[PDB]
Amino acid sequence: VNIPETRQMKFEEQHPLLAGALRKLEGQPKGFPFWYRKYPTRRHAYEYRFSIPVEMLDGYNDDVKKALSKGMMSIQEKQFAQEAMYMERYAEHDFDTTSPAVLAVKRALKCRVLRNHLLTNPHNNIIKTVLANTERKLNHALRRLRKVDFKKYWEIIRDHDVQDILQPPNLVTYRQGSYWKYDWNAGLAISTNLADVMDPRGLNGCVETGRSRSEVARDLGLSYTRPLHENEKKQLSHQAVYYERLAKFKMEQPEAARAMERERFVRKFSGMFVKMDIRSGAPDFPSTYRRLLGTKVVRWASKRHGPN
Amino acid sequence: PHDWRHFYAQEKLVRERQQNGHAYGRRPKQFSFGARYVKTDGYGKRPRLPYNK
Amino acid sequence: PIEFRFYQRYANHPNRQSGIQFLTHYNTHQRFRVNKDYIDYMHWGKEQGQARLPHRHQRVAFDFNDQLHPTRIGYAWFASQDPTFGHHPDLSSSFDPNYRVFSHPEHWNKMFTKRRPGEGDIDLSVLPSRSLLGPLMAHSDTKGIPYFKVDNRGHSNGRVPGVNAPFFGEFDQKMMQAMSRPLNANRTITGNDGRFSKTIMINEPQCNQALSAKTASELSKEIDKATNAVYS
Amino acid sequence: GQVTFGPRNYPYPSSRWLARRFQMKKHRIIKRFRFRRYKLAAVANLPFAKMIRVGMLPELKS
Amino acid sequence: LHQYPTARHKSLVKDR
Amino acid sequence: YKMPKNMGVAPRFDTWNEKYEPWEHMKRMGRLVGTGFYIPPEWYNHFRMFPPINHNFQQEKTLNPHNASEPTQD
Amino acid sequence: INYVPHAQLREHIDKELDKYVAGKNEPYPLNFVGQMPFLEDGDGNIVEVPESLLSNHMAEHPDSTAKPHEPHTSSSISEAAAFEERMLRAMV
């Protein structure tokens, strides 16, 4: 693991005199820590052991340099170095150790380490439980980061092309709309800066007229249509082609059309409840009339078929 | 000893809290005299916690 | 037995001898259910009576004739006061509120083994190391933290007349001025009333106890009200 | 049944006399079930089982 | 399964 | 089982002082005299003018060994 | 503190092994247990044994000649002690 060089570039840009001093004193022992601004925290110097900066090991022997090099770090030290390297690339500032991004990357690395350890030796039920708890915490951190920003998501989730993490736990809970209820409960229910992501003028409805958001969009000439898969596009095309097909079919081949019209005309006579009374008008006949569903009628077997 | 039940209950509480709060007053399984030296590969030699199994 | 008849006030079940003490600072009022500190019934209670009661440095209930928690300073500031007045008994240089004490059930646990004299799970974080290794390894040619001045916060409170600044006025051992209710809308006149005695205190330290016209009128009203009180 | 029927704040899990009446029921149930299990297992050694076996025997044709 | 003194009443046996 | 011989006659260690507390006697004698059909005793007639101190709670209720309840016994 | 380099490894090893050569004009350094082990000559042969272990050494395996090693007496530290010891030797 190595530090990104954006830190060196930023330090040289911010402090020209100190950077030039370091460059001119390269290879010479230094009694004053010019790199204090370069290394605000202990975790920000993970190249060498014990948070020793590279510039400090200048007037010392190559034996000491090798002993403090990366090749002499323990497993825990290597894990912490990798964690710090990943965290500093997502932290909003040097001291950012509470943001959901840094929390998520730290928890993800810890989960990876725990999974590797469990693959080696799986007889640690304590490790299994702590891995489950860390996975839960990582899921919560990512759910919280979702609402604050998603550019970080399209930056981080491309790691190994996961694109499927934060999967809903179960269909029974997901159907009742409790998977998205976490955003409501976390206080990030509605915080997206809607105006920047899309035009908010056509995303609402007129109270005075009562027309829906779609009606407002069509009146304003806008179209808020989500990306569509193949099946819905096929359905739309098939339904659109209906009038064009029928207009030519009726003219070209009126025989079959007239036969079907005769059949429908006689079917309307020979049916059930030709009068449009309340019984026939009942949109959900089995649900409305249940007391006669067992002994009077046999057509329906279940009293309800939909959510209502 | 049975007039000092509270002290041993505290000991058991400490052990239970240590082992993820699952096993209360449970001890690790007995192992053979040379269990760490005569058991073949793939078998646990050092006894584990009653929760770890 | 009394436990068989009355069970709402007494619990004879083992592992529940801790009680239902609400006077602790723990996250739950059930001491036997809390999992922060575990009672060592065999050795605790040396200076706090029973083993289940909170320690002297972790108590939130105070008697009438018992000293309160000393202030940690970490005399110099008593020059203006009586020269022969020694160090204030309520000022301690080493006082840790959350100072963990060694407990056998939590720290030196031996139930897993046969409880032999030679074994037992022990953690060394509870008590500071007495080994001479400490100072020798932590011996440096350069001076210590107080000389190097690496602390910028200082005291948590901005200005303490007892610690940070010189101390003026008169000492108040019993909490009398610190436990009182203001009788004036501007909180300049304060009053503490017992069953028969009423004490009225002027609190204007910003102006060296100087009274304005409105303050003097309010003070006169309070004086002639407290003097003309029935039980005064 | 309810083995731990001791009164409120009983310093013991149960009562020795009360536990015997439950142990007797458990022992009797286990004994009768074990005896019936052994009998129905020994049913397989009757010659009727041999007749069933020879009836279930298949034909091996070369 | 119910112990019952036949010679003397149970309450009379119990009220020691 | 083993039980101490005098466990049955063991005094209650938490409420054996409330009976002998001076304030209980003071209040009961005050009510009894105020009923109007009881000749006041000399101790009541004297201690009505000099009631005992208020803050002398016993260690049984204080459960704090470092409390100096009695100024005389301090 | 100087680590042993790869190039000087054999020289360091030879010096470490020759730290006990059964013959010197200066006292031998103690080991990590503060003891005086057997003084060995070249090519790995025990030739001197301290008097404390002398009886055990001669009992475990006989006909194994080994002069009982005696620590070098201190004379440069204090000259008067050397004269006293020589006078004691003369007086027997």
Added chain:
Amino acid sequence: YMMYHRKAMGTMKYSKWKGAHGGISHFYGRTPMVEEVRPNEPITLVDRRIMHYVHHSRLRHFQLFRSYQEKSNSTECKLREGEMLRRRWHRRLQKSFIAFMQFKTMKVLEDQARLVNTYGQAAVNAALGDPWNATDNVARERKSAAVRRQVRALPMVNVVPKHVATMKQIHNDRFNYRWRV
């Protein structure tokens, strides 16, 4: 078989003792006590002092108890905790006796002070044996010789209790006929 097992070191036609003996032996690294017996110190007294040490330290008790029979870990923990609690209670009981004996010593010292007051300091010293009649050095030398011989402290070890072999050996560390649970 372990070296402490009941059928260990058995003498039989088919049984051959394991390990090498003599010089560097099987017990060469496992000998707990080694003493160089010297003239004027009998080996019987050496063995007596060693046995008294290992008995008063409650170590032979544990050795026999763990060696002869097998006892469950629960039983061993129960016995050890009972022993610890009984020892603590006995220490608490004996502290009061020590305090009262110190008080009685104070009373004896007060009576000695009363005797000093009623007889004179010099008279009390003479009664205590002050060398006020030691005209020559030999007179005080005789008492110096007496106290020098009295200072000689012989070994204070006492005879160890015997071991009782009860039938079926319910308890193996039993050293007295008193019955125990």
Added chain:
Amino acid sequence: VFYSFVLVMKPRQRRFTSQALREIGVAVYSNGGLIRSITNEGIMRPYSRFRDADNTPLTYARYIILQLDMGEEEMGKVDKIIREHQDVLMALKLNNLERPVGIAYFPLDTFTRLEEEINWSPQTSADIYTQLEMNWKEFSRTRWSSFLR
């Protein structure tokens, strides 16, 4: 000190001992490690019996102390090699030198200093205090002057 092994080996010939030490050193340096120091004691007399080639108890052995700094991955392999080497009668591993039980948690205090000062030897006496005083004073006098050359 990162790691410190203590080995007991047969009192072989000088050539054989040198060959074994060369093999151990080559094995250590192959994994890109650094030996902090290696000290050799004499032919000691261990209490426990260690069996020789002829399955007989040999009560004489030679002690070697090997202080070094290597990563865990390479340390496992090197320790396995040293333990499986025939000449090494027995090897003991010391791993808690970085964080001894006597120790906000400054790690560089014990890593720089050798194991000898971490674990005082029996022959040490009171004069080591005066020796420490003299060494500390000279080092604090000369360290920056020698560093800024």
Added chain:
Amino acid sequence: RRREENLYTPIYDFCHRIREATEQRKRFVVVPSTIETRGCARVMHDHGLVAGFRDFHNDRAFAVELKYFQG
């Protein structure tokens, strides 16, 4: 800690701490600092049931000095 357990409130724990301190004969009680708890303490002080109260501007807790009469 669990669903079955009652959902405790600052008013509830303040009341129980005050009651326990009263039963144990204490002088000062440290009680949680909320607007409702401070109002309750002020009303009790006004009615004389409590010797006094002080809201030290600490986010967690404030102090209440109790009163006793005739033992």
Added chain:
Amino acid sequence: AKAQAIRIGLYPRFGNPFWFRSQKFRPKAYQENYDPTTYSTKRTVEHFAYNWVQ
């Protein structure tokens, strides 16, 4: 330390080769000089008897 020493061979599995030499470091309860905080009561009753006999 005992485990490490036994494993390496520096310490015997049973007994101590410095029990006699460690007696000076071990505290000695002199019979002549009384200690007020003695664990045993005989060391106090002997001094009581001595004073009474005087």
Added chain:
Amino acid sequence: RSGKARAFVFRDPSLRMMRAGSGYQQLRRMGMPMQVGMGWR
């Protein structure tokens, strides 16, 4: 254990009456339950 729980003392009658500020009878008197049947004749 088989027995139910019993209070140490009574519940204050004033508190018991005060906790009944939203009982079903009070709700009916306030008119919260909407009427859809015929009710009394």
Added chain:
RNA sequence: UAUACAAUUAUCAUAUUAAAUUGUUAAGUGCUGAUUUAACCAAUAAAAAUAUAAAUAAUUUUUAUUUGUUUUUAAACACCAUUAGGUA
């Protein structure tokens, strides 16, 4: 037949924030033979020893999963046999 538990502590199956897991050592005669046990007794009989510093308390345990049967050298060893052995 209708007509007011508790919530300050309740022993039989309601576990849910917890640091675990893994170390490679010990013991090796055959000799003229009565060991163990209340008693009988069976066949080489001696043996396996290393720790701490370090893992956040939380707002979706609603979520993986988990509580002394866990398979081989010795020592232990329950059915059954009776001159007396097998068997975790």
Added chain:
RNA sequence: AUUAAAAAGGUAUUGUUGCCCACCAAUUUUUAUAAUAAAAAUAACGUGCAGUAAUUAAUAUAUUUAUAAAAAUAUAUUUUUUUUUUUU
């Protein structure tokens, strides 16, 4: 001239000539109609003596044996009555 002088228990109240245990034996009830199974009441019989500090302690789970209480093992407990070591 070697001696009396400690602790330590009712499941019994008809109070050991006691409660109590299954089996055996006898009457009968309830669920059930399936050649079922299960559960409950009962003063005298027969085999015993399992439990009740109760004659090799008792409790819990697992295995096993069977005229019956139960018994023996593996593991975990004591509603088992208890006996003094603060660096020899």
